[PDB]
From a paper:
Na+/H+ exchangers facilitate the exchange of monovalent cations (Na+/Li+/K+) and protons (H+) across membranes to regulate intracellular pH, sodium levels and cell volume.
Following sample preparation optimization, a data set of 14,329 movies was collected and a cryo-EM map at 3.3 Å resolution was calculated, according to the gold-standard Fourier shell correlation (FSC) 0.143 criterion. The cryo-EM structure of NhaA is of the retained physiological homodimer. One CDL lipid (CDL 1) was located in the middle of the positively-charged part of the dimerization interface, flanked by two additional CDL lipids (CDL 2) bound at the ends of the dimer interface. Although this part of the dimerization interface is very positively-charged with four arginine side chains per protomer contributing — R203, R204, R245 and R250 — only the symmetry-related R204 residues directly interacts with the phosphate headgroups of the central CDL 1 lipid. Here we could structurally confirm that CDL binds between the NhaA protomers and it is there stabilised by interactions with arginine residues.
Author numbering:
A (entry chain A), B (entry chain B): 11 to 382
Write the structure that this text describes.
């Protein structure tokens, strides 16, 4: 609702300018990479501080996203076999065309082919903030469709990334991870009505698989999928937790995150995007693949029978929302960092540059085509 | 005021039987001596896990105690206009005689002289539960007097321990701690009704002085002091925080601490506390010094018009309330652990044995003299 994306923009530009002209030598290059090591007897964990920061922030953000999914799936839309045909078809369209277009001239080289899921990610706060500047010319249908599409897109991308092409972590880590989940199910079955116990068990589970990557992020979604929501005695823990967490994410979680990962050297940029395989695949994937991979499949779903277009919404609004949906920004940057770990910084820097250029271009094109 | 205390008793007996059992000491002893090292390339922190557990639990408990102190100082029993002379004089009495008796035998010996404040500490939850066991006709005045006396005694002992006979921290730690406090003062002065900001700044402060346990405990008290309480718009953050925190402290933190720090070994114990100087001094201070000192100084308080006895006391119940107040248990065990760190386990084991014996004897005597 409120235009809270200006804080994200100011944080991004502050991070971009901090890394140049006098700074970035004492800090921001020796910093954000100092190794940290935690040792308990034989057990030992070594990682960079940026990894810890990203893990914590994304764990919180995906806990919120899982809570939103649980609230939305049983109340409002997504409550029937036909009430969710349109967003599901839109997500299916957005999970095929941009990825297929990205891999057209990239899949030849494996080290860049591994990042096939970069353009499929979609941002949340930026698109809603962009919508916020329009005065009363924002139907509720557009907002509900946008969020219920981007959320499922991100969840599917994260699930697919976690399932395949993942390291085989220690069996002892999963031995205690397969018990906390069952403990969570037993606790929820008999009723708890206390978010503290659930949060404690979630912290235990998150620490269990902290040695891995995406699994730490997925722990938040798993935990948010289990907190009870059924209305009783005038109170509901899920709604209270959502209301409590909402201001923090838009002001402290998403900010201070774009301040860390975002920001490129921008010192030896030549040939614009270098016209290489990965920046071009990222730029074309989010600028053409998403607005075209969503509109066409939605049109197919808009056929006789199958899905029906929402009330107070025509194809033109669908196509502009599809244009806006081609924005990854922070989420796409995080996906790129996760997929390109233990890699020389040149690839990550080029991917971030391409993501920034594509997001800016898509946002300006979309805001240009809202009749004003 | 629920009964409680049974959880603490069962945790203590479980820890004792685990430690002294035939085939579980081999794991109980080794689990608490596992080193933990954290580093960021500099300022390495190496400590035993027991120290971390004690620091966290005591920080939370003392945050609650500081919140209670702030609540009761301006609108509670303490009130103003020096009308709360009785609890202050009682605390002054409890901070002199019990310490004097302890130091009588340990004056010459230098190594055991450090723990002069062992019997001054007073347990709150156990005494309150013992009182509530007979909660059929006991007046509220006795309960509030006991709680205020124990709280002020513990705070005075902890402050004196922190200020005097302490190590000196680094310049950077003190410099950081001198900015967070000023930040908290500015936040409170300018108005801030969100407890999340205060908790975050308190976490930063606690991490700043994490090197020394005493200052880590002091951080919680300071944070509880600085959180706003003034009534506005039919709500108060301090009261809500106290209500939220109350079930957790009496059900999770205290029993866990009791289970962690009550595992003494009953192997080769001869002549009770060997008729030594340290256990005998602890017993004399906790059993004889506390009630005699409390009663005597209360008598002098009444004598010279310094204070008037509260309603429904008649000085008959003051002796039994002092006997009940002569119970250290968890608090005295923690104080002994803090004072006797990096010392041979024999000394701390003997101190724990003496503390437990004195606490049990005082509790049974107090329950016997309450006329069943
Ligand atoms: C497990 C502990 C969680 C229970 C709980 O409520 O937390 C207590 C306690 C504090 O919670 P609380 O705010 O006092 O409880 C109020 C609940 O809303 C009150 O919720 P509740 O748990 O009392 O729910 C009513 C009751 C109803 O379910 C029944 O079993 C019905 C029959 C008995 C009810 C009375 C007859 O549910 C149960 O107790 C079922 C069993 C719980 C798990 C097994 O949890 C802790 O913080 C303990 C430390 C965490 C341990 C790990
Ligand atoms: C510093 C950030 C803390 C501010 C805050 O409330 O947290 C915002 C934000 C969420 O708090 P909130 O519930 O939206 O704030 C409203 C509060 O209920 C109530 O807090 P408030 O912001 O409405 O406070 C009353 C306000 C009202 O007093 C005024 O100064 C009036 C201002 C408008 C009047 C005309 C100009 O007083 C202030 O402006 C005090 C500013 C705080 C320090 C400067 O806190 C965070 O999570 C940010 C964390 C970042 C810090 C680390
Ligand atoms: C053992 C310790 C557990 C005791 C305890 O605090 O339990 C309360 C609480 C019981 O839940 P509740 O009764 O529904 O409390 C509602 C909120 O406290 C009511 O929330 P609120 O809006 O009144 O208070 C502001 C709250 C709301 O802000 C957040 O929750 C911040 C979320 C994380 C973003 C910042 C990074 O901020 C915080 O939680 C403080 C900042 C978090 C860490 C810095 O349990 C926990 O918080 C679980 C702690 C276990 C993890 C250790």
């Amino acid at each position: 609702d409120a235009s809270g994306g200006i804080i994200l923009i100011i944080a991004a530009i502050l991070a971009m300018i901090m890394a140049n002209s006098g700074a970035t030598s004492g800090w921001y290059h020796d910093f954000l990479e100092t190794p940290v090591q935690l040792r308990v007897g034989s057990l030992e964990i070594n990682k960079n501080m940026l990894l810890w920061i990203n893990d914590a922030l994304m764990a919180v953000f995906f806990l919120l996203v899982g809570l939103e999914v649980k609230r939305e799936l049983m109340q409002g839309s997504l409550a029937s076999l036909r009430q969710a045909a349109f967003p599901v078809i839109a997500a299916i369209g957005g999970m095929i065309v941009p990825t297929l277009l990205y891999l057209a001239f990239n899949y030849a080289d494996p080290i860049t082919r591994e990042g096939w899921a970069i353009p499929a990610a979609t941002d949340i706060a930026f698109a809603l903030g962009v919508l916020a500047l329009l005065g009363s010319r924002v139907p509720l249908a557009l907002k509900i469709f946008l969020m219920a599409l981007a959320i499922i897109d991100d969840l599917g991308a994260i699930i697919i990334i976690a399932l395949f092409y993942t390291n085989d972590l220690s069996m002892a880590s999963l031995g205690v991870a397969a018990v906390a989940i069952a403990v969570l199910a037993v606790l929820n079955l008999c009723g708890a009505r206390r978010t503290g116990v659930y949060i404690l068990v979630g912290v235990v589970l998150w620490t269990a698989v902290l040695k891995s990557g995406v699994h730490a992020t997925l722990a938040g979604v798993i935990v948010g999928f289990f907190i009870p929501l059924k209305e009783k005695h005038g109170r509901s823990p899920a709604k209270r937790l959502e209301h409590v967490l909402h201001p923090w994410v838009a002001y402290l979680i998403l900010p201070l995150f774009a301040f860390a990962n975002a920001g490129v050297s921008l010192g030896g940029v030549t040939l614009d995007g270098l016209t290489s395989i990965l920046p071009l695949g990222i730029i074309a994937g989010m600028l053409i693949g998403k607005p075209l991979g969503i509109s066409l499949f939605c049109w197919l779903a808009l056929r006789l029978k199958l899905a029906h277009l929402p009330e107070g919404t025509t194809y033109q609004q669908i196509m502009v929302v599809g244009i806006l949906c081609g924005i990854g920004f922070t989420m796409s940057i995080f996906i790129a960092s996760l997929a390109f770990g233990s890699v020389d910084p040149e690839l990550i820097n080029w991917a971030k540059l391409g993501i920034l250029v594509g997001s800016i271009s898509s946002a300006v094109i979309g805001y240009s085509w809202l009749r004003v």
